[PDB]
Amino acid sequence: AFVVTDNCIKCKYTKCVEVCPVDCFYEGPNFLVIHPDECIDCALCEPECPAQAIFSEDEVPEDMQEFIQLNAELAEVWPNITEDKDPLPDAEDWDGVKGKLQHLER
Ligand code: SF4
Ligand code: F3S
Numbered sequence: 001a002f003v004v005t006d007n008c009i010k011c012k013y014t015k016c017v018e019v020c021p022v023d024c025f026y027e028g029p030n031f032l033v034i035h036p037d038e039c040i041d042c043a044l045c046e047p048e049c050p051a052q053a054i055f056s057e058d059e060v061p062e063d064m065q066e067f068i069q070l071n072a073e074l075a076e077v078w079p080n081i082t083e084d085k086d087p088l089p090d091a092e093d094w095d096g097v098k099g100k101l102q103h104l105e106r
Contacts, residue, residue: 001036001057002045005067008032008053009100011091014084016045016054027081028074029105030088035075036068051095066101074106 004016009031016032017025024038034045036057046054055061060068094100 001039001071002034002041002043003055003057003060003068003071004032004034005053005055005060005064006098006100007051007096008049009104010088010094010097011051011053013050013087013091014081015048015050017081018084019044019048023080023082024075025081026075026078028078031104032081033071033074033078036072
């Protein structure tokens with residue numbers, strides 16, 4: 001599975017969903033997650049993320065290991081997103097700010 005981590009929050013560019021062959025991204029108000037059972041690890045999304053927030057599970061940074069379980073949990077409750085849309089209004093002000101998990105919205 002590929003995993004969306006911290007830098008997506010408050011950015012949510014949605015470029016990643018274009019390239020997904022199996023449509024396994026699920027949408028939250030200010031963040032996206034990958035459903036781990038559905039992802040086929042084709043890795044096509046992680047060049048596309050402008051926030052460089054997507055990682056192969058086995059490459060998730062040590063300080064971001066919570067995101068693996070979080071993607072699994074939230075994928076079950078959020079709606080499937082299959083079309084990209086516009087980025088959040090202020091996405092590049094937040095691009096690269098650290099510690100954005102305290103701002104996640106369910
Ligand atoms: S690795 Fe491939 S299948 Fe998994 S989320 Fe990214 S684009 Fe979709
Ligand atoms: S910012 Fe988030 S919405 Fe997709 S394009 Fe990067 S993982």
